[PDB]
Each structure stands twice: as C-alpha cells, then as structure tokens.
Design a protein around this ligand. Structure first.
Ligand code: ZN
Lengths: 138, 150, 208, 222
RNA sequence: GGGGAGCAAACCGGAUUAGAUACCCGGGUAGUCCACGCCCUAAACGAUGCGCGCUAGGUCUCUGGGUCUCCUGGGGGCCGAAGCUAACGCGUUAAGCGCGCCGCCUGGGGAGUACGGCCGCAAGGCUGAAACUCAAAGGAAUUGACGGGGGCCCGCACAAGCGGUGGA
RNA sequence: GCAGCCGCGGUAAUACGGAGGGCGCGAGCGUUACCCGGAUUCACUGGGCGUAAAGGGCGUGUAGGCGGCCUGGGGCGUCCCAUG
C-alpha cells in the first residue's frame, strides 16, 4: 500500500531529476501542494501546475537543472542534490523552536509543518514556532 | 609554487616463474597553500621513480577550493564505495583535525581549521580519493545562488 | 626538577637559534654558529623524513623549551587557553608572555630568561608595590613590574640597565630605566611576537 | 552558403536499434524505421554551421574523422578540399590523449621520406630497404591526413559518433568541441554540435560535408 | 495392515589391489507402491521475507484484449541507461530511489554440542550457552604455478629406420 | 631472554644482556587493575543480512505496528506565551 505520500513525492522528484526529466507528475493534495509551494519559491524547481491524468488530479512539478558541463559526462549539476524526509511515519519527529536545525551551514533548507502552517526553518524562527520537521533538502 | 607531499608508498608483488618481480606505489598531494590541490597515484619499478611519476599525475587532477576565512564553506560526507569522509567547517583557532591522509590533502588546500573524521574502510588510497571528491563538491553561498537563478 | 642542565644544546636540537643564554648566544657560539648539527653520536648523519607526529612534536618542544617550562604547566596553560574566547593559538602565547618571569626578561631586568627566574625567586622583583618570588605569576595589564629598592645597587642588574639605553622595549611595554621601573601595557598581539614557531602545529599536536 | 530542404537524402536511417535519448530527434516509424524530423535538423544545422563559421574565420582547425567504410573516401575528399586534417584509414588510440607520443610517428614519416630521396638509399643493405619501404607504406596510410596536425585541433568533426566513441571519448576529455553527423543510433548527450542525419548513405555524408566544407571556405574568404 | 514387477542399505558371494571392510560383477532383506496414523528435517536455494510507488530501452518466449505489419495487460528468460556493489555481479522478474511491517547476524574452533524445558512410539527435533583456545575464520578478484582439464603448436620426444650399450 | 599486538633470537640482532649516545617526563617515572574512549564493533544519532555471520522450509491469520483524496468539530500528541 502507499504508506507515506510526501515520501513518495519526494522520491518521484528525486527519482526524476536523476534521469533528467523536464517535469514529473504526482498525486495532488493540498498539503503536497504546500510543499511544492515552498520548493519553487525557494528555487529548487521551476514551479508546478494542477493537472488531470485520465480523470485524476495531479501536480506537474517542473524540474530545474544547472548548465551543461564541459569535458566528459556533461550531466548538469542538479539544483536539488539532496532531498530526504526526516520525520517518517512510525517515528515522527517534532522539533522545538530552539531545536530547529540549521541546514548545510544554511545552504539547504528545512521544512516543517507548524500550527501556523508549513514552513522554512528561517521562516519558523522568524515566526517563533516549531513543528513536524518534514524534510531536509539542499 | 607547488609543494610535493608524500601520502604513502607501498611495494607490490606480481608473480612469475621462479620470482616475485616487485612493483612500487606512490601517492602524492600537491598544491599551493592557496587552494589548488592535486593528487596522484604513481606506480613504478623504482620508488624515487614512482614518486617522480605520481608527481606528474597530481599536477593534472587539481581542484579549486572555495575558502571562507581559512575553512570550508559547508559540511559534507562523501561515500567512496568503501570509506566515507566527514568534512566539517570550524572556527579559526581550531586547526585541522584529521589524520595523515586528509591532513596532507587539506593542509595543501590551504585549509586551516576544520573538522574531519574517517569511517568505514580506512584505505589510504580510497580515503584520499574520497577527501578529493569530498573537496570537489564544496559550493559557496555564491555558487549556489548562481545555481537557482531565472 | 624544573630542568636546569646542558643548554645551548637544545639551541642545537631544534636547528633554530634558542636564545637561552643571552650574551654569548650572540658571540660566535649559541653553538648553532659552527655546529648546527643536533647532539648525539649521530648528529652529523642524514636525517629521514619526520612523521607528521614528529614535526607536530618537535615544534611543541621548540615553543616549550624556549619558555623553559615543565610540560605540566605548559599543557596546563594550553588547556586554560582553550577555555578562553579567542584564537586558541594567539591566546596561548598570551599567558605565555604574561608570566612574571618572562616579563622581567622583556623588561630587560635580565640577560636571559633563566636569569630572570632567579631574579624572581630570590626576590629582586617588585610588582605593583610588593615583592614576588613566584615566576609562574601572571602579570595583569597595568602593573609596575619593578626592582626591589634593596636590589638596585646590584653588579648584575646595574650592568644590565646600562645596556638598555640602546634597545627599544616590546610595544606592549614601558619602562623608566632611570627609576628601573616598567609597566605591562596590554596583552601582546601575535603580529607583535617574533618567535620562530608555528602555534598551529602546537595546537594540532594537542589533539592527538 | 546555406542549403535548401534537400530531403531527397537523409530522411531516416536505423531500424529499431536506436538510443532512447535520441527521442527528441525523430519524427516517426514507417516500415520499422525511425524517420528523423528534418524541420528540426534544420534548427540544429543553423547552430552547428553557426559554430564552424565562427571557427573558420577565427582561423582554427577542425579534425575530420569518419572510419565508416562508406564515408571513407569522402572524408579524404572534404578535408583535402578544406584546409583540414583528417583520419581516413583507421583511428589510433590516442591521437589526442596521446598526441605527443603519436606525433613522434609523424616525425618518423618525415625522416623516412628524406632517405627515399637522398643518396643513402641502395647504398646500405637491401634487407633494411624493404624493412623501411614498408614503414613508409603503413605510415602513409594512417597518418596521411594526421600530418597536418601542428598541435591539438580546435574541433572534431565526427561522422558516425557511436562508431568513433573513442575519438569522441578523447575529445570529450581534452575539452575539444565535437561535431557530428549523427543519427538514431547515437547518444546526443555527448556531441557538442550534432546534426541528426542518415549517414551510411553516401548521398548523406556527401552532402553534409560538402556544405560544411563549402561553409568553411566562404568563411575564410576564398 | 496390505502389496512386492524393477531397483536396492545392510548382509552373501565374485573379481580388482600391497590390502579393499570400495569404486566393477551376480544375488539379496528393510525400503521403495497403497491406506490410516506419527515424524518435520534439508544446498526446504533465486543460498535474495511480504506489500505499494518511482527510475532508458532491446530482444527471445508463454498467455489474454485490441481498430492485429502496430498498440495494450500478465508471466518466464537473455543483454543493458541512470544508479548500486568489496568485487562477481544486480539492473522496471532490482542487489536501483523510497515508506510500512515481520524475521535474523554482532570474530573462528569449541557447537548446533553441554545444561534446562518443550515436543516424539523411537530415531530424534525445536530452543541453545559457556570455560577454554586461536589471531584468525572469511568473500571476491590478481599473478602465477599446478590438473591423472581443454584447444593449438614445436624438438631425433615416439613412430619409421641404421647402428649400438646392457653379455666377454 | 623480550613481548601489548605483528614479532625478535640458529655467529653480521637498530627487537636479548651491558655500554656510549638519544628521546620522553621530573620528585617523580614505570607496572598492574578497573571506568569511558578509540568501536558507527549493539548502529536513537550512526550498521547489516545474494556469495562475507545473517530472511524464518511455506502458508494462514491473533495481539500489535503502519495507512489513500476533500470539508468541518474537538484539540489528546505537537508547537508558542506567561507563571510556579
Ligand atoms: Zn646558546
């Protein structure tokens, strides 16, 4: 069974970039939408539009890559090198505001879900809250 | 200019009828105390010779290194099949903190204070190799912005 | 046992000039002049490439031996220096240069570091008014490190100051030869030090 | 020069042995064959030719290489017709990674050419004679074109890339531009400047190079 | 308890051999087939827990639907992108990228033993240590040698031939 | 005879025993014993199971763990503030 949504998502994303696709589909859902909402505004991706595949609702997340390298294997640096769920189901991990992590000397980002909504470590702290720390991405 | 530093040398055996014809292995690190560091694996029948060989190799596989006030702009762990390497930036006054190999490589990178740690197989060769792809990955705050633009 | 044995031999072990006897380690003879090889029956022998450890080591000692101070204090200092907010290295030399016995030396109230000790243990030293015999003492900034009224007319000390009219004092120090006094201005900066050492190696050494 | 819509030539080539990555470059299947979208090929060309022109007038060099049996004679021609170096016969492992070690062979040709003109010919053994005569022969086969290489080329015009992947591999590691008359069977991911096109057809290679070399010339100004 | 053609532990003889309680030959009882009941282990092996999603294709093949020189679903194979792997290898039949959940490992030998309990008619099985003792045990690859392994090729190496030593 | 471990010693021992010399530390220096450490070698951080030790011989399902899209109530977990 599909045991963790977000998780799948992240993996479709992760799994797509690696092969270098332009965009990748993925089951829609307000929440998942708010995460993609972040990515693009954070710049890890171009953007995403709502869609219907044979009648079902899907989110087209549009991939973003780096320039063509020189020399051998000109496989472009990927905008999203790292991306993993931190709090998994059956080992959920909530953090306190003090405890919010700094990612990659603050190069990456972290996304939680606070009672004031789904956020970025930076935003959270600016916001004075903490919550389910969904994922690392850099 | 460039400072040759000797990682390590090993003598290997190739077999044959009635003898154990040997072969020498050299590992060198080369750099500027600025930020270019080469690294070669020079193999040869005579050591001074292998060394001389490794020399050549290294001067080619150099790696420009970003250098915020003497340290590394951001942590990184890099798996090298076997060995893994932790690279973690620290404050001035802490001084390099690794072993023989990564030191040698960082030392010449002009890295000054930094926090290492070796894990998994501790094969000089690999470890080294790892500390390379290690450094090769590092990216500046700048370098990243440039990466997500437009 | 706070060392005290054959000296300008260490001037020789390190291969760098160790101003351990003062006058003389200026005449052709801190021995490094004309016999730079290290001691031992094998001094004149070709030396193999020194392990990372070796250098880290030899360099600790170079520091240490200069100040001529039992590892136990030396290491203690380095510990106390790690606990202070600062550049773990520069601060080291900080206290290192702040010891009463050293000060006296820099103040010129003595031919050498060693000599300075005695001067202290024998109590020819005033400190902000009172005498002091504990060298290891830490001279705070703004202290009048001086000479005891009693000691002023001394064949040694006298002949020393006589020399001072002719040498500038460390930038972090003042002294009124005329009255044989001297003040400790402010902790000296790394840039101000002359030492032929590389703290980094010293630090690097204490993490093994 | 610029050339028409001469479709009477490279519509498509390989069966279903293709390379997925090549997808972007095909129109459709017809009788079990991939047919290359030419309207597109045109968009490539307009770029690839833009590049060469830049090279030509900038006064660079381009090594022409195609070992395929068909293009064989045409490689020779075109490079000859152009002020260029080519590899007709066979491609030697390293005419770039190991250029300096190869260039030494050139010298051998240079040095033997001499003796077969000087008095010191017959005057000295006849066993060696043949033993040398042969050496020329072989050299004047492989290096026939390679001779014009004073240093490393500013670009490699490759015919069938997937066949010369070595020569590509090399160029790819020395940072030298790669141009190719590639088709269905190639992996575009490694050609700096591709040209989607049939190639076994003499009519293909013959056109692609013609207009290419023609371009080169009108670029220099002759 | 029934059944018993053939095969065949053990066992009877035969030959082989320094010997043969074996490999070869001739016989031969349990057994092997059936019913009921017990035993329950195994290289019970893909030596690869079950389920869901995602990641280029090519080709052979079983099978189903389609507008059937092509498309589309399910299964079995071989080659193979990216990726992974110590390496061999794996590769939409994952040893790839991920989530759930179960089982199991934590140096070799001593030991699958000892002791204890459970189970069984018995044979035994399941669970399962330590003392002591050793610095290894171990995987995959390399180069070699080597095989009463293979292919191919040489030399008065054999054959073919003449002449001899071994005798006096 | 040494020895923590790999080992050293059968007439050329930087590995035994003395000596010269040297390094290290100094009223101390060694040794043994025990704790944490190195050991991400019990792995929450931070491990594994094709051949290296490791998938239960298979199935069935009990407790239990884990669970799809939209909207609302409650707010227990969870986050923030103050306070003891
Ligand atoms: Zn001296």
């Amino acid at each position: 069974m599909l045991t963790d949504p977000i998780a799948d998502m992240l993996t479709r994303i992760r799994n797509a970039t690696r092969v270098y696709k332009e965009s990748t589909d993925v089951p829609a859902s307000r929440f998942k939408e708010e995460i993609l909402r972040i990515l693009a505004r954070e710049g890890f991706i171009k953007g995403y539009e709502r869609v219907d595949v044979d009648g079902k609702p899907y989110l087209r997340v549009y991939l973003k890559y780096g320039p063509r390298r020189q020399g051998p294997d000109p496989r472009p640096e990927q905008v999203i090198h790292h991306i993993r769920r931190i709090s998994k189901p059956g080992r959920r991990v909530y953090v306190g505001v003090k405890e919010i992590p700094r990612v990659r000397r603050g190069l990456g980002i972290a996304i939680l879900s606070t009672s004031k909504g789904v956020l970025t470590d930076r935003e959270a702290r600016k916001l004075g809250v903490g919550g389910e720390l969904i994922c690392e991405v850099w | 200019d460039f400072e040759e530093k000797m990682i390590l040398i090993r003598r290997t055996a190739r077999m044959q009828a009635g003898g154990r014809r040997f072969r020498f292995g050299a590992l060198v690190v080369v750099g500027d105390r600025q930020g270019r560091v080469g690294l070669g694996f020079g193999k040869a029948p005579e050591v001074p010779l292998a060394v001389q060989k490794a020399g050549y190799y290294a001067r080619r596989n150099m790696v420009e290194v970003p250098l915020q006030n003497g340290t590394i702009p951001h942590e990184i762990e890099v798996e090298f099949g076997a060995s893994k390497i932790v690279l973690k930036p620290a404050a001035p006054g802490t001084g390099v903190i690794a072993g023989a190999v990564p030191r040698a490589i960082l030392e010449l990178a002009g890295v000054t204070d930094i926090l290492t740690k070796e894990l998994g197989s501790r094969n000089p060769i690999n470890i080294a190799y790892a500390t390379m792809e290690a450094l090769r990955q590092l990216r500046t705050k700048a370098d990243v912005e440039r990466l997500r633009k437009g | 046992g706070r060392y005290i044995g054959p000296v300008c031999r260490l001037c020789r072990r390190e291969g760098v000039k160790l101003y351990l006897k003062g006058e003389r380690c200026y005449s052709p003879k801190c021995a490094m002049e004309r016999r730079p090889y290290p001691p031992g029956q094998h001094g004149q022998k070709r030396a193999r490439r020194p392990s990372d450890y070796a250098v880290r080591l030899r360099e600790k000692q170079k520091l240490r031996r200069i100040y001529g101070i039992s590892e136990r204090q030396f290491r203690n200092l380095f510990e106390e220096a790690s606990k202070k907010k600062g550049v773990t290295g520069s601060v080291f030399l900080g206290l290192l240069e702040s010891r009463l016995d050293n000060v006296v030396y820099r103040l010129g109230f003595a031919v050498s570091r060693r000599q300075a000790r005695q001067l202290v243990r024998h109590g020819h030293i005033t400190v902000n008014g009172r005498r002091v015999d504990l060298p290891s003492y830490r001279v705070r900034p703004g202290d009048e490190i001086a000479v005891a009224e009693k000691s002023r007319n001394l064949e040694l000390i006298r002949q020393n100051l006589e020399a001072m009219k002719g040498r500038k004092v460390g930038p972090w120090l003042s002294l009124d030869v005329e009255g044989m006094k001297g003040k400790f201005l402010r902790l000296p900066d790394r840039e101000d030090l002359a030492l032929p050492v590389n703290e980094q190696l010293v630090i690097e050494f204490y993490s093994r | 020069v610029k050339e028409l819509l001469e479709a009477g030539v490279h519509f498509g080539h390989e069966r279903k042995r293709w390379n997925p990555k090549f997808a972007r470059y095909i129109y459709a299947e017809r009788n079990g064959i991939h047919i290359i979208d030419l309207q597109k090929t045109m968009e490539e060309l307009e770029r690839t030719f833009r590049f060469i022109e830049d090279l030509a007038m900038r006064g660079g060099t381009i090594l022409f290489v195609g070992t395929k049996k068909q293009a064989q004679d045409i490689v020779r021609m075109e490079a000859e017709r152009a002020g260029m170096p080519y590899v007709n016969q066979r491609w030697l492992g390293g005419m770039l990674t190991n250029f300096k070690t190869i260039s030494q062979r050139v010298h051998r040709l240079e040095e033997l050419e001499a003796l077969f003109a000087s008095p010191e010919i017959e005057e000295r053994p006849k066993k060696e004679q043949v033993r040398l005569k042969h050496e020329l022969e072989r050299l004047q086969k492989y290096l026939s074109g390679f001779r014009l290489l004073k240093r490393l080329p500013d670009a490699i015009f490759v015919v069938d890339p997937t066949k010369e992947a070595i020569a590509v591999r090399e160029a790819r590691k020395l940072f030298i531009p790669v141009i190719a008359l590639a088709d269905t069977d190639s992996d575009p991911d490694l050609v700096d400047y591709i040209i989607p096109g049939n190639d076994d057809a003499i009519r293909s290679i013959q056109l692609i190079l013609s207009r290419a070399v023609d371009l080169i010339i009108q670029a220099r100004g002759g």
